[PDB]
Design an enzyme around this catalytic site. Structure first.
Site, PDB file in Angstrom:
ATOM      1  CG  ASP A 141      -0.393  -4.124   2.558  1.00  0.00           C
ATOM      2  OD1 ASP A 141      -0.850  -3.816   3.503  1.00  0.00           O
ATOM      3  OD2 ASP A 141       0.252  -3.673   1.712  1.00  0.00           O
ATOM      4  CG  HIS A 200      -1.850   1.342   1.182  1.00  0.00           C
ATOM      5  ND1 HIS A 200      -1.587   2.243   2.243  1.00  0.00           N
ATOM      6  CD2 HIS A 200      -2.714   1.557   0.428  1.00  0.00           C
ATOM      7  CE1 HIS A 200      -2.794   3.135   1.808  1.00  0.00           C
ATOM      8  NE2 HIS A 200      -3.442   2.839   0.973  1.00  0.00           N
ATOM      9  N   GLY A 242       1.175   5.711   9.444  1.00  0.00           N
ATOM     10  CA  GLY A 242       2.549   5.759   9.384  1.00  0.00           C
ATOM     11  C   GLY A 242       3.435   4.529  10.090  1.00  0.00           C
ATOM     12  CB  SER A 263       1.718   1.049   6.758  1.00  0.00           C
ATOM     13  OG  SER A 263       0.384   1.014   7.344  1.00  0.00           O
ATOM     14  CB  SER A 272      -1.174  -4.887   6.355  1.00  0.00           C
ATOM     15  OG  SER A 272      -2.141  -4.242   5.423  1.00  0.00           O
TER      16      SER A 272
END
Lengths: 181, 4
Positions: free
Chosen positions: A55, A33, A135, A137, A152
């Protein structure tokens, strides 16, 4: 730069997952992402991305000396990483990320389906009772020196707690023929 | 849930 530290592109911020090697070449795993956003990162150039469904994404480092095979603990220390593994329900884990730093909890579910609404659905996610915030992720999910996943998403936050989902790191490594450093 |  180590796992859990900030990686940016224009005004967007994510966290580095794990530094890895692809045929001796230094790269960094992060969330898909995140890599979908752009090909240009503070640390180098994106060479792969997969989101949604999966992801995960990978970035080739501009500076190979920066591929630190550890996770930053946000207390001036680091955790060395030596292998990648699969998570198990009830496992004690830690997550490192650039918004909330280091947090701990345990795995509460595997192979969870996560509907992110307009962003799509991801399958086969590790589920934990560890908090995270925007932030965080792409950051590291690990247990000691064993790499387990990449942050994720989830619900909640670190003040009230919440549920978070992680992309299993082994699927990302095999997708790109990478090995953790 | 949402992507972080």
């Amino acid at each position: 730069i180590a796992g859990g530290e900030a990686i940016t592109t224009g005004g967007s911020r994510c966290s580095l997952g794990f530094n890895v090697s692809v045929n001796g070449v230094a790269h960094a795993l992060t969330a898909g992402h995140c890599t979908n956003i752009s090909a240009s990162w503070s640390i180098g150039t994106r060479t792969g991305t997969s989101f949604p469904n999966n992801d995960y994404g990978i970035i080739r480092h501009s500076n190979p000396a920066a591929a630190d095979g550890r996770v930053y603990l946000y207390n001036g220390s680091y955790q060395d990483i030596t292998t990648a593994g699969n998570a198990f329900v009830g496992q004690a884990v830690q997550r490192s990320g650039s918004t909330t730093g280091l947090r701990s909890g345990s795995v509460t579910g595997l192979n969870a389906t996560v509907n992110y609404g307009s962003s799509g659905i991801v399958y086969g996610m590790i589920q934990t009772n560890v908090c995270a915030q925007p932030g965080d992720s792409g950051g590291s999910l690990f247990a000691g020196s064993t790499a387990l996943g990449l942050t994720s998403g989830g619900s909640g936050n670190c003040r009230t707690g919440g549920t978070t989902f992680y992309q299993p790191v082994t699927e990302a490594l095999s997708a790109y023929g990478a090995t953790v450093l | 849930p949402a992507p972080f």
